[PDB]
Nucleic acid binder design. Structure first.
Ligand SMILES: [Cl-]
Length: 373
DNA sequence: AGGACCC
DNA sequence: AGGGTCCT
């Protein structure tokens, strides 16, 4: 049973939000700064050589006119992110969030509903919206092609609604599973879409230049694969299954070897409301382990406002720390009476105990509310 | 708790 | 960087 999946990928998301907030930035090169880092930038800045996650000095020495806005407070980005997800959920309810700026939508049922409504002569006029990957020829008699073209039409409706209703541009990719939809959505950027017909799957997967470019193959797995002489997609396709299992475990080995062929049976999961709320701060050294209570009190204060708005409350609190020159965490249940929401002073007490439990009286402090109900 | 992955 | 997910 084949599926029609769309991957929606917002262009330079934080920059888009900031440009909407201050139109004066719309025509100037823009970078969103967090600490010493340019986490993202609009395309005007990318023209001038600015890259994501490029340190501010390197970025200013490449674009001295680069306008910098602070993006350490994620509140506005998070709000717009959920407006996108909710808009897509109106199309079809099964929407999976991947970070703040990507969504997967399973269009299968929607596509079949639209096809049922078409007349015979109507079927021969089905047209693609946007790009066809690798300029592949469409066969209107192929039912897989028809379904994917209808997927491309729904994807264009989504992108038009996002722009008309929210002012945001993004790319979309339409394919038969999540892996392929996500790989194909970035083929034409920015603000464009691409559909992958099945015959071009091997062309898409072999277009990658490192196995680390496969979604799901992270730093540790890549480093491990490279240690085995596996570098290209075809290397992973042809590597011995038995050895790969022994080195990576059978779960990781079998899944990522399927990914190397473009195979991905994973379902689109309805993300729904978030599973956790957290806030953090990075810094160079906080060994005044009495200022930590101040940092933790500030983080806790802002978090408390967010928990009130969601309406659901956390049943677990967690404190994370990073050690000077990799993280450690302590969690514990939140006492039931404390959940009625002055909750600061008890929360600080709980958190400090977790703190003291971990540190003997730091480059990061993070507080998380989780286990929601 | 810790580790893998994602943006 | 400042967030998130699920698995062991
Ligand atoms: Cl499987």
């Amino acid at each position: 049973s084949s599926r029609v999946i769309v991957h929606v990928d917002l262009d330079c998301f934080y920059a888009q939000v900031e440009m909407i907030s201050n139109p004066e930035l719309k025509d100037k090169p823009l970078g969103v700064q967090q600490k010493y880092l340019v986490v993202t930038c609009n395309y005007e800045a990318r023209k001038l050589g600015v890259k994501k996650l490029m340190n501010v000095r390197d970025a200013k020495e490449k674009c001295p006119q680069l306008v910098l806005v602070n993006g350490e407070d994620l509140t506005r980005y998070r709000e717009m992110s959920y407006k996108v997800t909710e808009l897509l959920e109106e199309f079809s309810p099964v929407v999976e969030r991947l970070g703040f700026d990507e969504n997967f939508v399973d269009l299968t049922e929607m596509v079949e509903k639209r096809l049922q409504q078409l007349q015979s002569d109507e079927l021969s006029a089905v047209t693609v919206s946007g790009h066809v990957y690798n300029n592949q020829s469409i066969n209107l008699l192929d039912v897989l092609h028809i379904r994917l073209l209808v997927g491309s039409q729904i994807a264009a409706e989504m992108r038009e609604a996002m722009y008309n209703q929210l002012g945001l541009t993004g790319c979309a990719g339409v394919a038969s599973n999540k892996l392929l939809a996500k790989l194909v959505s970035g083929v034409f950027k920015p603000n464009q879409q691409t559909v992958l017909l099945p015959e071009s799957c091997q062309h898409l997967i072999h277009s990658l230049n490192h196995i680390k470019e496969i979604p799901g193959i992270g730093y540790k797995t890549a480093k491990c694969l490279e240690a085995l002489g596996i570098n290209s997609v075809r290397d992973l396709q042809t590597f011995s299954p038995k050895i790969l299992e022994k080195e990576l475990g059978i779960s990781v080995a079998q899944r990522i070897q399927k990914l190397s062929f473009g195979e991905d049976n994973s379902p689109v999961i309805l993300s729904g409301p978030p599973q956790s709320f957290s806030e953090e701060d990075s810094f160079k050294k906080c060994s005044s382990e009495v200022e930590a209570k101040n940092k933790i009190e500030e983080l806790l204060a802002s978090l408390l406002n967010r928990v009130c708005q969601d309406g659901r409350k956390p049943h677990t609190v967690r404190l994370i720390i990073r050690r000077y020159s990799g993280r450690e965490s302590r969690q514990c249940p939140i006492p039931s009476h404390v959940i009625q929401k002055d909750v600061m002073t008890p929360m600080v007490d709980i958190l400090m105990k977790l703190f003291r439990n971990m540190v003997n009286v730091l480059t990061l402090l993070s507080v998380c509310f989780c286990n929601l109900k």
